[PDB]
Design a protein around this ligand. Structure first.
Ligand SMILES: [K+]
Ligand SMILES: [K+]
Ligand SMILES: [K+]
Ligand SMILES: [K+]
Ligand SMILES: [K+]
Ligand SMILES: [K+]
Ligand SMILES: [Mg+2]
Ligand SMILES: [Mg+2]
Ligand SMILES: [Mg+2]
Ligand SMILES: [Mg+2]
Ligand SMILES: [Mg+2]
Ligand SMILES: [Mg+2]
Ligand SMILES: [Mg+2]
Ligand SMILES: [Mg+2]
Ligand SMILES: [Mg+2]
Ligand SMILES: [Mg+2]
Ligand SMILES: [Mg+2]
Ligand SMILES: [Mg+2]
Length: 95
RNA sequence: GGCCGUGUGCCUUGCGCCGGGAAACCACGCAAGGGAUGGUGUCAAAUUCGGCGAAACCUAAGCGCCCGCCCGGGCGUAUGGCAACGCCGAGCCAAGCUUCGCAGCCAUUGCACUCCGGCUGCGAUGAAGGUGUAGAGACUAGACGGCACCCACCUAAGGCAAACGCUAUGGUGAAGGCAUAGUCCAGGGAGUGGCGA
C-alpha cells in the first residue's frame, strides 16, 4: 500500500468545501510538532483538489506522521497518507 | 401636406487613388444622380458636470468703395447670429461578452509544483456601445440602437477533399435617435419691456 520514502507526503480524500487559505493553517498545528514544515502546497483545481503536500526538513518527521496520524478523521473524512513519487523543486536543488 | 432651391449627412455610379485585406471588398478624395436597402427574439437602465468645432442661411457695427466735402445716404463685406450637425475630458449604466471573488446544485478520488472543470444565482471589475448631444423640458414604446440568432447574395485564408470542388469565423443588404414614433410642456402663430448697431 505504501511506496518508497520521501521528503514530502501525499494526502488525499478531503472535504473540498474548505478554502485554500484556511486549510494551510490546520496543518501548521497538527503536523508542525512532528517536525518543522518548510512549505505547504495546496490547490483547489480539478486535478489537485482535496490533496495536500507537506514538506519536512528530514524524512523521520514524515515516517512517524505516516503511522501516528494514519486514518486521521479530518473534517469528518478519513485522511489517507502516501509518499510523494517525486521530490520538490526546492528540496531537489539542495540534495 | 406638396413642388423648387442652397447646405450637411447618406447610398448608387463614374473617376482618382494611396492605405487595409488572402479574396470578395472595406477605407480615402471628388463629381453627378436620388432607381434601389432582408427577417424573429432579446434587453429598457444610466439619462450628469464641463469643454472644442461648424456649413448654408439671417443680419451689416467696423472697415473699404461711392454719392465732387459735410448733413445725410447707397454699395460690399462677417469678425455678429441662428443652426443642420463633427467631437473631446470626467462621472455613470440594462442585457450579452472578458476577468474576479462569494454562496448553491452537479460531476471529480485525482502526485503536485506556473494560474486554470460545468452550470443557474447574486456582488464586482474589463472591453465594445450608450449617455453628455431635444423645440428649454417631462414621460412612454420599439429601432434607424446594445445583444443573440436567422435569410439572400459575394468571396474563399484557414479547415475539409485523391479530385471538378465544399465550407464564414470574412464581406454586401445607406444615413436619419443632436429626440425617431407618440403623449403632455415650450416657442411661434399673437403682446409688452430690457440688451444689441
Ligand atoms: K430636395
Ligand atoms: K492596394
Ligand atoms: K466615452
Ligand atoms: K441622444
Ligand atoms: K482554401
Ligand atoms: K456573418
Ligand atoms: Mg429613392
Ligand atoms: Mg425610468
Ligand atoms: Mg458720413
Ligand atoms: Mg456707412
Ligand atoms: Mg449675402
Ligand atoms: Mg460665421
Ligand atoms: Mg455639453
Ligand atoms: Mg434629426
Ligand atoms: Mg440618441
Ligand atoms: Mg434639432
Ligand atoms: Mg419627434
Ligand atoms: Mg414673439
Amino acid at each position: 500500500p505504501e511506496t518508497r520514502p520521501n521528503h514530502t507526503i501525499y494526502i488525499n480524500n478531503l472535504n473540498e468545501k474548505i478554502k485554500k487559505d484556511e486549510l494551510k493553517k490546520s496543518l501548521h498545528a497538527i503536523f508542525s510538532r512532528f517536525g518543522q514544515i518548510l512549505d505547504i502546497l495546496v490547490s483547489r483545481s480539478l486535478k489537485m483538489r482535496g490533496q495536500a503536500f507537506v514538506i519536512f526538513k528530514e524524512v523521520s518527521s514524515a515516517t512517524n506522521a505516516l503511522r501516528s496520524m494514519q486514518g486521521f478523521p479530518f473534517y469528518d473524512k478519513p485522511m489517507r497518507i502516501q509518499y510523494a513519487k517525486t521530490d520538490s523543486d526546492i528540496i531537489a536543488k539542495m540534495k
